[PDB]
Every structure is written in structure tokens, then in C-alpha cells.
Amino acid sequence: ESTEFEKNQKRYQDLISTFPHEKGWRPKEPLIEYGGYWWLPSLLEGCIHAQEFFQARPSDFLVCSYPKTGTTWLKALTFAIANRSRFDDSSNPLLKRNPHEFVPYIEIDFPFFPEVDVLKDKGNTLFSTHIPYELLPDSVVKSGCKMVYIWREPKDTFISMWTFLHKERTELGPVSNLEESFDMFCRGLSGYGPYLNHILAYWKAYQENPDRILFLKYETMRADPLPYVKSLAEFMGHGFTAEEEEKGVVEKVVNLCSFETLKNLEANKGEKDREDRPGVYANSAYFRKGKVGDWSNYLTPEMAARIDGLMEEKFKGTGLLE
Numbered sequence: 229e230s231t232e233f234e235k236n237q238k239r240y241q242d243l244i245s246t247f248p249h250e251k252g253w254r255p256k257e258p259l260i261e262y263g264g265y266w267w268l269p270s271l272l273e274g275c276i277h278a279q280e281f282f283q284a285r286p287s288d289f290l291v292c293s294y295p296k297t298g299t300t301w302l303k304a305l306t307f308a309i310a311n312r313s314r315f316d317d318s319s320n321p322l323l324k325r326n327p328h329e330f331v332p333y334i335e336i337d338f339p340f341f342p343e344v345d346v347l348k349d350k351g352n353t354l355f356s357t358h359i360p361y362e363l364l365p366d367s368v369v370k371s372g373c374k375m376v377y378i379w380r381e382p383k384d385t386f387i388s389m390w391t392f393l394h395k396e397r398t399e400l401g402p403v404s405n406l407e408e409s410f411d412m413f414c415r416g417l418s419g420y421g422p423y424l425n426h427i428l429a430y431w432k433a434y435q436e437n438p439d440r441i442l443f444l445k446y447e448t449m450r451a452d453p454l455p456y457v458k459s460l461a462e463f464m465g466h467g468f469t470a471e472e473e474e475k476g477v478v479e480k481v482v483n484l485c486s487f488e489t490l491k492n493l494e495a496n497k498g499e500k501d502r503e504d505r506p507g508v509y510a511n512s513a514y515f516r517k518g519k520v521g522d523w524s525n526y527l528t529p530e531m532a533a534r535i536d537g538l539m540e541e542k543f544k545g546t547g548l549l550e
């Protein structure tokens with residue numbers, strides 16, 4: 229028999245068919261506007277399904293991000309934190325499977341691959357999404373479940389995405405060139421974009437309810453991960469004890485989930501695919517360079533100025549820089 233998504237897909241497609249379409253980053257893949265944000269068509273189908281069907285519980289923990297800001301890393305960290313009493317760090321499941329297998333997306337795995345083991349386990353508390361805050365399913369909002377939001381400096385975020393897209397298995401055509409892609413990104417014409425709007429709505433939610441949302445920043449964690457990993461553990465209700473700290477448990481969590489550890493696992497090497505459900509990226513696509521500032525290998529000073537200017541104007545006086 230067919231899944232709930234399958235039973236509703238034809239009406240979802242009919243629904244979104246007359247939403248405004250714009251040119252996207254691929255010739256055959258337009259972007260579609262819903263709720264003030266732009267969407268890849270399948271992912272919008274996903275979002276609508278999640279809005280209608282996803283049921284959050286108060287004890288759930290939701291990882292939220294715009295794409296390419298640290299999602300993979302956070303998925304590893306949250307899993308590792310929550311499950312460290314089950315696993316010696318030589319027998320952690322993160323050594324055998326990509327972190328995305330352990331934290332299902334509410335708008336990808338939940339609609340498209342509902343049969344994955346993690347989604348059949350009510351004992352799982354970990355979920356993820358890129359859905360903009362204003363468009364989160366009403367159950368998430370009503371449940372009161374905790375959320376962590378991660379963002380990243382926009383030049384590095386754009387470059388992370390633009391390189392990543394070259395690794396997608398797709399019949400919808402080659403990615404737009406760097407200049408055009410970047411113009412689009414600056415104009416807010418990107419999947420789940422505009423990026424800066426994405427961040428700002430989560431930030432305002434955080435300001436209104438700092439008990440419920442934790443706001444992390446990729447560069448900040450990257451320079452000094454230990455304090456943030458303690459903070460995250462504590463916020464999730466799995467805080468590290470004084471004995472764990474003394475025993476180097478936090479360092480072990482950080483090392484397990486580090487870029488260098490995960491990038492070099494056989495599971496994540498070359499063309500190897502995830503094993504829970506079909507993927508359009510090799511696992512290795514999620515581990516590129518893992519640094520701060522790589523934009524300067526790709527963008528010109530004029531490009532950098534344009535986006536730097538846009539962010540300064542949007543966020544001045546909000547607290548996100550200050």
C-alpha cells in the first residue's frame with residue numbers, strides 16, 4: 229500500500245503548480261515561492277506534507293539550519309551527545325554511517341522515505357529541518373519542543389552550496405555559473421532563501437523565547453567547539469557531568485564528530501551512498517574543506533562587498549553581529 233505522502237502527492241503538485249515560479253540555479257529546476265521563501269519543487273512538496281502531517285512531541289529536539297551552514301556536523305553532535313551512554317567511541321554508529329541517517333529531515337525523510345528505521349522508532353527524539361521558522365508545522369510550534377539553530381557567514385555559505393551542487397546526481401542540468409549563482413543568492417533566489425531572512429526569523433524567535441531555542445554559529449563553534457558542545461548537551465537535557473568532563477568525554481564527542489574524523493571514514497569516501505534510503509549525493513559530498521574563509525578562493529572583492537553590504541544593512545541593530 230502507498231504512503232500518506234503518496235496518497236497526497238498529486239494534490240500537493242496541483243497546489244504548487246500555480247505558485248509563482250522563478251528561474252533557479254539549474255535550467256530545468258525552477259524555484260517556487262511559498263510563504264515569502266523560495267523552494268526547490270520537491271522540497272516544497274515535502275514542506276507542505278510536513279505542515280499537514282508531521283506531529284512533534286514536547287520531548288522532540290529539532291535541528292534547524294539554512295543549507296550548508298553546519299547541518300551535518302550538528303546532526304553528528306546531537307546524536308553523539310544523546311547516545312553516548314550506549315556506545316564506546318570505537319563502536320559508535322557514526323563511524324559506519326553518514327550522520328544524516330540518524331537525524332531525519334521533516335521535509336525529506338518524513339514525506340519521501342517514511343519507512344526508514346529511525347522514523348519508525350518513537351524512541352527517537354532527533355529531527356531536522358531547513359523549513360523557515362514562519363513555515364514550521366503548527367505541531368512543532370505548539371509542542372514547545374526545543375530547537376537549535378545554526379548559521380554561517382554568508383560568503384562561505386554560498387560557496388559551500390555552489391561547490392556542493394556540482395556533486396548532485398540530477399537530470400535537471402548543470403549548475404549556473406558562479407557569477408549568476410551569486411547574483412541569485414544575493415537577490416534571495418536560493419532554496420529555502422532568502423538566506424538572511426531565514427536567519428532573521430529564527431533570531432527573532434530566539435529573542436522572544438531564549439529558553440526554547442539555542443542559537444549557534446558555525447565559525448564560533450569551529451574556533452572553540454568545547455564550550456558550545458557543553459552548552460548544546462546541557463540544552464538538550466543530556467549535560468555532561470563533572471566526572472565525564474574530567475574523563476575527557478567532551479573532547480571525545482568533539483573528536484568523533486570532527487570534520488577530519490568524519491571525512492576520512494570509509495562510509496563517507498568516494499562515491500559511496502547512504503544505506504537507509506536513496507540519496508542524490510554521495511556521502512563524501514558533505515565533507516568538502518571544513519574551513520572558515522574559503523570564499524576568498526572563489527569570490528572577487530566586489531562580490532564580497534555586495535553580500536557583506538547586504539548583511540550589514542539587514543542585521544544592523546538586531547544583535548546578530550553585536
Ligand SMILES: C=CC/C(=N\OS(=O)(=O)O)S[C@@H]1O[C@H](CO)[C@@H](O)[C@H](O)[C@H]1O
Nearest residue numbers: 257268294295296297299358396419508
Ligand atoms: C537536502 C536538502 C537541502 C539541500 N542541501 O544541503 S543540506 O544542508 O544537507 O540540506 S539542497 C539539495 O540540492 C539540490 C539542488 O538542485 C536538490 O534538487 C536536492 O534535492 C536538495 O536536497
